[PDB]
Scaffold this active site. Structure first.
Site, mmCIF file in Angstrom:
data_model
loop_
_atom_site.group_PDB
_atom_site.id
_atom_site.type_symbol
_atom_site.label_atom_id
_atom_site.label_comp_id
_atom_site.label_asym_id
_atom_site.label_seq_id
_atom_site.Cartn_x
_atom_site.Cartn_y
_atom_site.Cartn_z
ATOM 1 N N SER B 46 22.621 15.892 43.998
ATOM 2 C CA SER B 46 22.924 17.167 43.341
ATOM 3 C C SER B 46 21.713 17.909 42.760
ATOM 4 O O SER B 46 21.847 19.095 42.414
ATOM 5 C CB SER B 46 23.977 16.979 42.258
ATOM 6 O OG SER B 46 25.188 16.543 42.896
ATOM 7 N N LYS B 49 20.667 21.253 44.187
ATOM 8 C CA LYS B 49 21.288 22.523 43.845
ATOM 9 C C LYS B 49 20.248 23.522 43.324
ATOM 10 O O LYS B 49 20.473 24.707 43.433
ATOM 11 C CB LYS B 49 22.415 22.318 42.829
ATOM 12 C CG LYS B 49 23.675 21.716 43.457
ATOM 13 C CD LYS B 49 24.888 21.779 42.534
ATOM 14 C CE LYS B 49 26.159 21.269 43.222
ATOM 15 N NZ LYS B 49 26.258 19.802 43.172
ATOM 16 N N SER B 94 28.540 20.805 38.938
ATOM 17 C CA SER B 94 27.924 20.237 40.119
ATOM 18 C C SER B 94 28.890 20.213 41.282
ATOM 19 O O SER B 94 29.136 19.163 41.903
ATOM 20 C CB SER B 94 27.336 18.876 39.819
ATOM 21 O OG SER B 94 26.261 18.581 40.680
ATOM 22 N N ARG B 226 21.409 8.772 31.813
ATOM 23 C CA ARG B 226 20.363 9.643 32.402
ATOM 24 C C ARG B 226 19.785 10.521 31.293
ATOM 25 O O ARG B 226 18.585 10.494 31.005
ATOM 26 C CB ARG B 226 20.988 10.519 33.479
ATOM 27 C CG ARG B 226 21.367 9.788 34.741
ATOM 28 C CD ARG B 226 22.255 10.560 35.711
ATOM 29 N NE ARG B 226 23.412 11.201 35.112
ATOM 30 C CZ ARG B 226 24.221 12.012 35.784
ATOM 31 N NH1 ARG B 226 23.942 12.350 37.032
ATOM 32 N NH2 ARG B 226 25.317 12.499 35.220
HETATM 33 C C1 LIG Z 1 25.428 15.241 42.756
HETATM 34 O O1 LIG Z 1 24.567 14.437 42.887
HETATM 35 N N1 LIG Z 1 26.780 14.938 42.975
HETATM 36 C C2 LIG Z 1 27.846 15.904 42.744
HETATM 37 C C3 LIG Z 1 28.462 15.444 41.436
HETATM 38 N N2 LIG Z 1 27.337 15.521 40.613
HETATM 39 O O2 LIG Z 1 27.444 15.427 39.291
HETATM 40 S S1 LIG Z 1 26.019 15.076 38.486
HETATM 41 O O3 LIG Z 1 25.224 16.246 38.689
HETATM 42 O O4 LIG Z 1 26.466 14.575 37.152
HETATM 43 O O5 LIG Z 1 25.347 13.909 39.085
HETATM 44 C C4 LIG Z 1 28.982 14.016 41.527
HETATM 45 C C5 LIG Z 1 27.954 13.030 42.067
HETATM 46 C C6 LIG Z 1 27.183 13.558 43.270
HETATM 47 C C7 LIG Z 1 28.007 13.401 44.554
HETATM 48 O O6 LIG Z 1 28.421 14.370 45.168
HETATM 49 N N3 LIG Z 1 28.486 12.171 44.783
HETATM 50 N N4 LIG Z 1 29.315 11.678 45.792
HETATM 51 C C8 LIG Z 1 29.474 12.156 47.036
HETATM 52 C C9 LIG Z 1 30.529 11.470 47.855
HETATM 53 O O7 LIG Z 1 28.694 12.960 47.534
#
Ligand SMILES: *C(=O)N1C[C@H](NOS(=O)(=O)O)CC[C@H]1C(=O)NNC(C)=O
Ligand SMILES: *C(=O)N1C[C@H](NOS(=O)(=O)O)CC[C@H]1C(=O)NNC(C)=O
Ligand SMILES: [Cl-]
Ligand SMILES: [Co+2]
Ligand SMILES: [Co+2]
Ligand SMILES: [Co+2]
Ligand SMILES: [Co+2]
Ligand SMILES: [Co+2]
Ligand SMILES: [Co+2]
Lengths: 242, 241
Positions: B46, B49, B94, B226
């Site tokens: 993420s 982004k 996200s 984190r």
């Molecule tokens: C980003 O790394 N993502 C999207 C979402 N992010 O939240 S965060 O910014 O707190 O890390 C959740 C984790 C991750 C993601 O998409 N994970 N899983 C999959 C299946 O792609």
């Protein structure tokens, strides 16, 4: 349109204070205030003028960007944070009047007046000293007029560059967390009676924006924290913030 | 990059492994607890982004931070994804599927050109055009994140000044009378190792401190670490109170 809600008076009374909070719900296009007459009462903007002054200074290239350093002039003033170098971000944060007085001098009366008419800023009257009119001259603006101005800024609708408007909104940043963002500016008009404190700005939520403008009688500096405290009690009462 | 192993106490504390990297902009000096891991390149997940937003804005795929990207009606595991979003909220929560659609509209050729302009990581977009930063060939280290973020901070990337200002608005995480944090979290799960990221910077009155951290994250339970571990480092270094 402003709906009156006198229940907010309890937060003034609680604090031995008199004044007005004005809220505007952007999504619903509805306004709310504890005191309709005082909401439309015009006062000197004092340091709240740093919002339009900033915009004009950036638009004209008086200020290049938010990193440009305005060196302390070497004159010791009563507010310690003023006696040092600043940029636009810190000059807003610490409300450094002499930095903004230098902008006004460079902007000059002709452009200043043209801009305030473009902005529809209060009574559009800059009479008095070019370097102090918003502290002791003829300009006046009400809380509802602050809201009308701020809405234009929020939507980049003022007659200055988009860039200028984005930089000033950055410089207005006051508080942010996972629940809301506040962009705002304080003021304290002391030079001409009645002495009054201001706080004007908005609260950004995920799905809406609430504009606010408050002022209150402020006979001494020891009540200044009540500007934000009373405003936030109102915002919490209305479930805008937790 | 100077090594400061005393920051390992904050990882040990929390039964954790990882790396924090800090860059003192005024002094032009960097500090980390682990020089090797600081330079180890991972999937950005993420944290991608940031560049993806910049590219989408610069190309007009996203008009501004108010444009609404309507939920596609597919219910996903993360509730906040199941609703309309704008750039601000898509970053905050996200929202991957919004950013996957950006990437398809950007397309492979333009995405690659932009990632070269940005010097972003290994500049390799191999994989699906809408998932390569989650399970394709792109890799970036914590020190490379900081190099990228510095350029963004200074509006030095090869996209409009306006795109950069908008993304830095959308990165806004925390502000008070002491500091402002602009940052982006990530969690790379699809391909081992599972790691959490936090990258950004802390603005002070008179300096900026850039950061980038990653840590092992075998489950979603520890994700709060984190920010928490980063902030313990910032506090130990007197950057925040
Ligand atoms: C980003 O790394 N993502 C999207 C979402 N992010 O939240 S965060 O910014 O707190 O890390 C959740 C984790 C991750 C993601 O998409 N994970 N899983 C999959 C299946 O792609
Ligand atoms: C603005 O109204 N100013 C400058 C400074 N502002 O602080 S505030 O934003 O917290 O209110 C201090 C008060 C005021 C001002 O300059 N007061 N004194 C004079 C002589 O006008
Ligand atoms: Cl901002
Ligand atoms: Co109360
Ligand atoms: Co007029
Ligand atoms: Co708009
Ligand atoms: Co600790
Ligand atoms: Co190449
Ligand atoms: Co290559």
């Amino acid at each position: 349109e402003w709906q009156e809600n006198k229940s907010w008076n309890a937060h003034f009374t609680e604090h031995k204070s008199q004044g007005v909070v004005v809220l505007w719900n952007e999504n619903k296009q509805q306004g709310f205030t504890n005191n309709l007459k005082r909401a439309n009462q015009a006062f000197l903007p004092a340091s709240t003028f740093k919002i339009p002054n900033s915009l004009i200074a950036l638009d004209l290239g008086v200020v290049k960007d938010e990193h440009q350093v305005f060196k302390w002039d070497g004159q010791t003033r009563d507010i310690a944070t003023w006696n040092r170098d600043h940029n636009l971000i810190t000059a807003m944060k610490y409300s450094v009047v002499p930095v903004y007085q230098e902008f006004a001098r460079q902007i000059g009366e002709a452009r200043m007046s043209k801009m305030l008419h473009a902005f529809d800023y209060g009574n559009e009257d800059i009479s008095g000293n070019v370097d102090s009119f918003w502290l002791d001259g003829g300009i006046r603006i009400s809380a509802t007029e602050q809201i009308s101005f701020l809405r234009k800024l929020y939507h980049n609708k003022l007659h200055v560059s988009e860039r200028s408007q984005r930089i000033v909104k950055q410089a207005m940043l006051t508080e942010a967390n996972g629940d809301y963002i506040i962009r705002a500016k304080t003021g304290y008009s002391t030079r001409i009676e009645p002495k009054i404190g201001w706080w004007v700005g908005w609260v950004e939520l995920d799905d809406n924006v609430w504009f606010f403008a408050m002022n209150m009688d402020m006979p001494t500096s020891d009540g200044l924290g009540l500007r934000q405290a009373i405003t936030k009690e109102v915002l919490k009462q209305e479930k805008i913030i937790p």
